[PDB]
Structure formats: C-alpha cells, structure tokens
Design a protein around this ligand. Structure first.
Ligand SMILES: CC1CCN(CCSc2cc(-c3nn(C[C@@H](O)CN4CCC(N5C[C@@H](O)CC5=O)CC4)c4c3CN(S(C)(=O)=O)CC4)ccc2C(F)(F)F)CC1
Length: 221
C-alpha cells in the first residue's frame, strides 16, 4: 500500500521553478529536476543543476537538438558519459543554443544510471514517485487550455497520449474528489499554481503523462 499523497517539495528535494522562455528546452529542465532530487537525497544539498549544460553539450550524439527539443533519457546518458554536470549557478540558463562550455571544476552532480518505466502504467509511475523520487515525464501540452491553466486539476478532453513537452512529476494526491499528478513545469512562477500544474491521474494516461517516464540515480561510490 502506497501513500495517499506525496510531495517531494516537502522533503526539500525540488529547486525553484525555472523559466524556459522561447527555447524549447523543457526536456533539459525535466532531466535536471529529476537529478536535483537524487542529489539532495544523497548529499543533503539542494542545488539547481545546469539545464544550459544539457542544451549546449547533450546534442547530436544523444539525438538532441538543444532549443529545438530533446529526450530526458539521453540527457541522463550524456551526464553518465560526461562524468558530471555543472551547477546551474556556474553555467546559468540563457534560453538559446550555445557552444558547449562544460567545466569539470564546477561539477555539481554525477549520474550512475537511469530507468525507463512502461508505457501508460500509472500504477508503476505512482510507485516510482513514492519509492524513488520525482520522475521525468513528457505530456501533451499542445492545447490552449494548458497555456491558460491557472489552478485546480487539469483535464483536457482532447488530450492525446503523444507527448511533446518535458515536465517533472514531483508528487501526486487526491483533492476535492479529483486524483492528480503534481507536476513541476518550466514556464516560470506565473504559470498555474506558482509554476506547478496538477494533472488528472488514473484517467487513462491523460495527456500521455505516463507514456515515457524515466528517472536517474546517483549510487554510493
Ligand atoms: C529533434 C527531436 C525533437 C523531439 N524530441 C522529443 C519530442 S518530446 C518527448 C518525446 C519523448 C519520446 N520518447 N519516445 C521513446 C523513444 O523514441 C526515445 N528514444 C529511444 C531510443 C534512444 N536512443 C539511444 C541511442 O543510443 C540511440 C537512440 O535512438 C533515444 C530516445 C518517444 C517519444 C515521443 N513519442 S510519441 C510521438 O509521443 O509517440 C514517440 C516515442 C519523450 C519525452 C519527450 C519530452 F517532451 F519530454 F521531451 C526529440 C528530439
């Protein structure tokens, strides 16, 4: 039996909501967000990791195209191969494609492995969120209702299970008769509920939230 609700923000495992701007780097924000939580769990320190590092460096070898899109999974593989990722403070976000400027002197996290969860399995996603930490996911955000969301549990009748926007599932719950996923977006603090959107849970993989989940890990040693 899993907890009825979880919110990794209450464990100090989630950094401030970021603002991707006109650069399509939600995949990089989803990836660093998941890794930030594992880093806090392991070292006790909460530090924003560099999304810009992924945009500029996890490029064609990883099937990614910076501001024109990418994958959380191959962002993790880049961090594995690179043997690190810089802090966001040392390599801050510029919302544009740049030359890779990774500097091991400012390494703030490492990545040992990542795991992918089965398509559409909201039970498995719930278990991972409860027992592993925030989970990187894609959602179908191509709906004016998504851009216009202010509060409550988001439900979009025309949503599909094809994903196009990377976000971070930092929890779940059940409020006002509606089960939801607690989702950290990267459109700044003025989007939704202080930068978060609660999305309908157990409604047949609504907006593809469980289509392509993955989470990274940092192992001892
Ligand atoms: C320029 C492109 C523009 C679009 N972006 C993503 C679109 S957004 C997006 C898409 C996905 C995503 N992952 N996968 C699984 C697989 O395809 C991933 N790949 C497996 C093999 C891997 N590897 C390992 C290497 O060794 C070789 C290789 O190929 C590489 C990864 C799919 C999708 C989209 N779906 S769909 C239309 O929903 O059905 C098709 C299948 C996930 C998150 C996002 C998120 F929104 F969160 F960002 C990608 C770059």
């Amino acid at each position: 039996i899993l907890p009825d609700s979880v919110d990794w923000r209450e464990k100090g495992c989630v950094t401030e909501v970021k603002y991707q701007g006109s650069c399509g780097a939600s995949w990089a924000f989803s990836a660093v967000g998941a890794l930030e939580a594992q880093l806090k769990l392991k070292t006790g320190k909460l530090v924003s990791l560099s999304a810009q590092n992924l945009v500029d460096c996890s490029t064609e070898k990883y099937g990614n195209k910076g501001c024109n899109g990418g994958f959380m999974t191959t962002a993790f593989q880049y961090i594995i191969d690179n043997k690190g990722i810089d802090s966001d403070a040392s390599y801050p976000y510029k919302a544009m494609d740049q030359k890779c400027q990774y500097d091991s002197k400012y390494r703030a996290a490492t990545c040992s492995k990542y795991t992918e969860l089965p398509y559409g399995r909201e039970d498995v996603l719930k278990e991972a969120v409860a027992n592993k930490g925030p989970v990187s996911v894609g959602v179908d955000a191509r709906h004016p209702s998504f851009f216009l969301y202010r509060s409550g549990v988001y439900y979009e009748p025309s949503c599909t299970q094809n994903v196009n926007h990377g976000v971070l599932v930092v929890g779940y719950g059940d409020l006002n008769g509606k089960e939801y996923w607690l989702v950290k977006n990267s459109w700044g603090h003025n989007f939704g509920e202080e930068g978060y959107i609660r999305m309908a849970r157990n409604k047949g993989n609504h907006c593809g939230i469980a289509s392509f989940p993955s989470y990274p890990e940092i192992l001892q040693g």
